[PDB]
């Protein structure tokens, strides 16, 4: 009963959709969010309605939501932006404001969580056009950005940015034009999962993989389940990666919201349907994974006809946790007062510096 969805609680942010989130061993960072409901979205107190220009964090050890009071210039593209975590920094690229397509983003912002600071990268070269819904990845210390519509016309470029020299370039090698897809990688190839236009959703039984070495695209036919079949075609889903494994969760094809979760092995290309169904099936949500191997899911749209959002947060264990993680969870559950003791008291107890930093 460990690989099931468990709803967390403990002031939680209002319901939002279109946001993104990333996770490390300590906190879950949530950026962006859009909610058109006036009463739900903090009323007149939210000066950026219907956009959530707030960066939140969930503390795993204490189960508390903290809204960061960062400085600098928070980017205005708060819907369908792309966010990644590199070391102790958040890299934000793309996205759109409101109304959709009126003002998109094509630059890169960086936020240091430890310093809690915002800045803009001074990258030079031919940058991608202002797009949203694209997908990025970090491979070999370089940024790969693919897809994303410009608002009226779709894109298929595979731009690459060198972070060491901060140099932009376009990769010239074909997959269909799509947006709100997902990216997987293994250091040699980049795999496209899901996505689609506003009138169709592309099937996941065939995957387009771009080869960095050969500089050409290829098509891979994934094997199906034993008696379940391929995952249903979906867009606006969520994807996480653990070693050579890719987990797809949520999304919808246009008329039905899917609340299942699937796993694909990047070596044998075999699909596995995990026996877990969401308590509330959502799309356009955000999902993230921790180095331990726990997946967190937040936000999204619950009803496709009433256009109802949610603020429920769920956690699930995708792999067998390490003994350190199991002991940590049991100790935190058994003795909630541990968070109140100072660092010296915990050191006298015997906890290492890293464990204290995670707890405190």
């Amino acid at each position: 009963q460990l690989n099931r969805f468990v709803q967390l609680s403990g002031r939680p942010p209002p319901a939002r959709s279109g946001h993104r989130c990333v996770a490390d061993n300590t906190n879950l960072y949530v950026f962006g969010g859009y909610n058109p409901d006036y009463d739900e979205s903090g009323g007149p107190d939210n000066e950026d309605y219907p956009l959530f220009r707030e960066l939140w964090r969930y503390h795993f050890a204490t189960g508390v939501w903290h809204q960061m009071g960062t400085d600098g210039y928070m980017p205005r593209e708060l819907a369908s932006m792309s966010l990644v975590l590199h070391g102790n920094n958040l890299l934000v690229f793309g996205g759109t404001g409101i109304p959709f397509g009126e003002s998109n983003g094509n630059d890169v912002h960086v936020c240091n969580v430890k310093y809690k600071r915002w800045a803009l990268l001074s990258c030079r070269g031919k940058k991608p056009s202002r797009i949203y819904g694209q997908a990025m990845a970090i491979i070999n210390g370089s940024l790969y950005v693919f897809g994303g519509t410009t608002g009226y016309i779709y894109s298929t470029d595979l731009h690459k940015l060198d972070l060491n020299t901060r140099e932009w370039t376009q990769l010239k090698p074909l997959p269909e034009e799509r947006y709100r897809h997902e990216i997987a990688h293994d250091g040699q190839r980049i795999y496209i999962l899901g996505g689609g236009t506003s009138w169709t959703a592309y099937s996941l039984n065939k995957i387009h993989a771009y080869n960095l070495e050969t500089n050409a695209w290829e098509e891979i036919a994934t094997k199906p389940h034993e008696k379940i079949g391929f995952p249903a075609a979906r867009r606006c889903h969520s994807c996480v990666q653990i070693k050579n494994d890719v987990f797809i969760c949520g999304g919808y094809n246009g008329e039905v919201i899917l609340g299942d979760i699937w796993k694909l092995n990047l070596q044998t290309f075999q699909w596995v349907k995990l026996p877990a169904t969401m308590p509330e099936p959502v799309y356009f949500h955000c999902a993230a994974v921790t180095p331990a191997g726990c997946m967190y899911i937040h936000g999204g749209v619950v009803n496709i006809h009433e256009n109802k959002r949610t603020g429920s947060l769920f956690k699930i264990w995708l792999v067998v946790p390490s003994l350190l993680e199991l002991a940590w969870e049991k100790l935190l559950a058994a003795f909630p007062n541990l968070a109140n003791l100072s660092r010296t008291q915990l050191l006298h107890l015997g906890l290492t510096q890293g464990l204290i930093e995670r707890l405190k």
Binding site: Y34, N35, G151
Partner: peptide, 4 residues
């Protein structure tokens, strides 16, 4: 082409 909703972004949310």
């Amino acid at each position: 082409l909703r972004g949310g």
